Paper text:
Kinesin motor proteins hydrolyze ATP to produce force and do work in cells. Despite their diverse functions, the kinesin proteins contain a common motor domain with highly conserved or invariant sequence motifs that mediate basic motor properties, such as microtubule binding and ATP hydrolysis. Here we report a new crystal structure of human kinesin-14 KIFC1, together with new crystal structures of Drosophila Ncd, a KIFC1 orthologue, and human KIFC3, a divergent KIFC1 paralogue, and an analysis of the structural features of the proposed KIFC1 AZ82 inhibitor-binding site.
The new KIFC1 (2.25 Å) and KIFC3 (1.85 Å) structures were determined by the Structural Genomics Consortium. Both proteins were crystallized bound to Mg-ADP and are reported here for the first time. The largest difference is observed for L11, which is much shorter in KIFC3 (14 residues) than KIFC1 (30 residues), while the adjacent helix α4 is three turns longer in KIFC3 than KIFC1. In KIFC3, the side chain of H630, corresponding to KIFC1 R521, is not long enough to interact with L5. There are no other interactions between loop L5 and helix α3, consistent with the open conformation of the potential binding site. Kinesin-5-ADP-BI8 superposed with KIFC3-ADP shows that KIFC3 helix α4 is longer than kinesin-5 by three turns, elongating the α4/α6 pocket.
Author numbering: 445 to 683, 687 to 767
Amino acid sequence: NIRVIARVRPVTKEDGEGPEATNAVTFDADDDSIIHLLHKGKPVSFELDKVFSPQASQQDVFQEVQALVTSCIDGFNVCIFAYGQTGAGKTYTMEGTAENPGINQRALQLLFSEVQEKASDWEYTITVSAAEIYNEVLRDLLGKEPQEKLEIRLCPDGSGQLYVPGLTEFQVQSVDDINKVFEFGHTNRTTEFTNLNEHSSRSHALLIVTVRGVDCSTGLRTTGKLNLVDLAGSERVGKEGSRLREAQHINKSLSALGDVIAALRSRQGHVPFRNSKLTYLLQDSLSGDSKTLMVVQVSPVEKNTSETLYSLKFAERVRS
Ligand SMILES: Nc1ncnc2c1ncn2[C@@H]1O[C@H](COP(=O)(O)OP(=O)(O)O)[C@@H](O)[C@H]1O
Ligand SMILES: [Mg+2]
């Protein structure tokens, strides 16, 4: 149910030239689950569920996702997380570019094509919401300025399921529709009266896709949730006051996410969902028969081996 993989991005301009850009990440010839880090002259090795090299394409990465996405059609819930330091490629993996679309566009494209193949008795509705978690505050990335703080409430039917009053939902039917939603989101982040955080690297951004089906011949209903999560950057911040508090919020929320996934993966009795807004919000898409994919992004170069080490230790911790 719970899988942890790493993606090593290629060298970027930010990596520079000279000794700092020397390669530090190598691999095993036979086992694609192994990653080797050279850290301050000493080798450290890690085992994950799968490791993607700097040659891995967006399509290669999506092969880890396509089966999860089709299960949402059937009513399963899924979370996909991108984790790692700012600059390691989280947004590239999740959103991609026009020339190289990421997981978000490929997942929605696959949902639309799967829906189009269902029998004529079925009616599917696909909607998207987008939310920001900044310093444990939840706001609607697609909401009207000034965006209020949102509450996470228990459904009043006693099911124990959670909902977010006032979170906006956009109906989408095509990749062109989702592109229009994403463009609106980008513009909406920096309006004059916004309460959204300008620095995307310091907040968790969640794209919540809801897939609702009804078999119109019987009234049978399915509800699948696909949560596409571009996490705040994990890098350590050297010792603002407000910058430090922000870094501490991020550290505690990411650590809580790791605690929750590790507890779920090991099928321990107590899963501490309540310890963070992110894990509490997503608990119905993490527990039970839900499926989770954690994608740990790392830089390949010597300059970043401290943060690569921290990121890969996080990956091994949640695996386990
Ligand atoms: N797999 C990849 N292939 C090519 N370029 C990448 C890849 N991952 C990241 N990049 C590039 O690295 C830079 C930082 O990536 P970004 O997605 O902004 O990282 P993050 O969201 O983790 O801060 C961007 O310029 C992006 O184009
Ligand atoms: Mg980013």
